[PDB]
Specification:
- There is one protein chain.
- This protein is α+β, with helices and mostly antiparallel strands.
- It has a single domain, classed as Histidine kinase-like ATPase, C-terminal domain (Heat Shock Protein 90), CATH 3.30.565.10.
- 30% of the residues lie in helices and 22% in strands.
- An 8-stranded mixed β-sheet has the order 1-6-5-4-7-3-2-8, with helices on one face.
- The radius of gyration is 17 Å and the shape is globular.
- Bound molecules: 5'-N-(2-hydroxyl)ethyl carboxyamido adenosine and magnesium ion.
- The site of magnesium ion has 5 residues, from loops.
- GO terms for molecular function: ATP binding; ATP hydrolysis activity; ATP-dependent protein folding chaperone; CTP binding; dATP binding; disordered domain specific binding; DNA polymerase binding; enzyme-substrate adaptor activity.
- One of its GO terms (biological process) is cardiac muscle cell apoptotic process.
- It comes from Homo sapiens (Human).
């Protein structure tokens, strides 16, 4: 059972800009997704201080980076707080608490796309390198869901079964054909060292089986 939703207009406009603006410094997408994971880990860390049972779904707080050249995917996995179904729909589908409006105004007034994280919309930088993004997520208060969008103004949400996570979020980037550099181990290492070296959780780069 798949539900289809329209992005809020301003989010569709933001996505279109990210997809269509000429901008070569695409590598910042990884910093933005890792920062979102770090925020999610901070949140479950804090909540678990006063309710240790919130870690029954996994004590380890970390980030995994999983390249797969066969599938042309890069996946960013965390064991953070995760998202409920409502969280997915509100947080990824609408302006919500973000600075979407301020960012689009800023770009008209001299800002550039690398500043996207200052405005709380770094997630959408995924579309610098991905033709499709799938978000698998599990919150302690809810079942596992899959959010998906290839932009074009809509996204889908469905329940996700058969491969349960304990808790957290997986952002699966189905890369554009000319963005496969982000599957290369030396490139990923370079970007993590350059932009994410102070993140306060372990970041493990998986090795490919092929
Ligand atoms: N890795 C993640 N884990 C849990 N929640 C996440 C997440 N990445 C993004 N989110 C949620 O979705 C929001 C988000 O990025 N919305 C898109 C920008 O408006 C975050 O503020 C955050 O609430
Ligand atoms: Mg919880």
């Amino acid at each position: 059972e798949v539900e289809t939703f329209a992005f809020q207009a301003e989010i569709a406009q933001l996505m279109s800009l990210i997809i269509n603006t000429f901008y070569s410094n695409k590598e910042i997408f990884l910093r933005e997704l890792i920062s979102n994971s770090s925020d999610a880990l901070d949140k479950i860390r804090y909540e678990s201080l006063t309710d240790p049972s919130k870690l029954d779904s996994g004590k380890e707080l970390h980030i995994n980076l999983i390249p797969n050249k066969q599938d042309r995917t890069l996946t960013i996995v965390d064991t953070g707080i995760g998202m409920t179904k409502a969280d997915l729909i509100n947080n990824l589908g609408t302006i919500a608490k973000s600075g979407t409006k301020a960012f689009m105004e800023a770009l008209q007034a001299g800002a550039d796309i690398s500043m996207i994280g200052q405005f709380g919309v770094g997630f959408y930088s995924a579309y610098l390198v991905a033709e499709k993004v799938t978000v698998i997520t599990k919150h302690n208060d809810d079942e596992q869901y899959a959010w998906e969008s290839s932009a074009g103004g809509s996204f889908t949400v469905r329940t996700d079964t058969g491969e349960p996570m304990g808790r957290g979020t997986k952002v699966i980037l189905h890369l554009k054909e000319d963005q496969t550099e982000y599957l290369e181990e030396r490139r990923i290492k370079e970007i993590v060292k350059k932009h994410s070296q102070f993140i306060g959780y372990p970041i493990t780069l998986f090795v490919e089986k092929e």
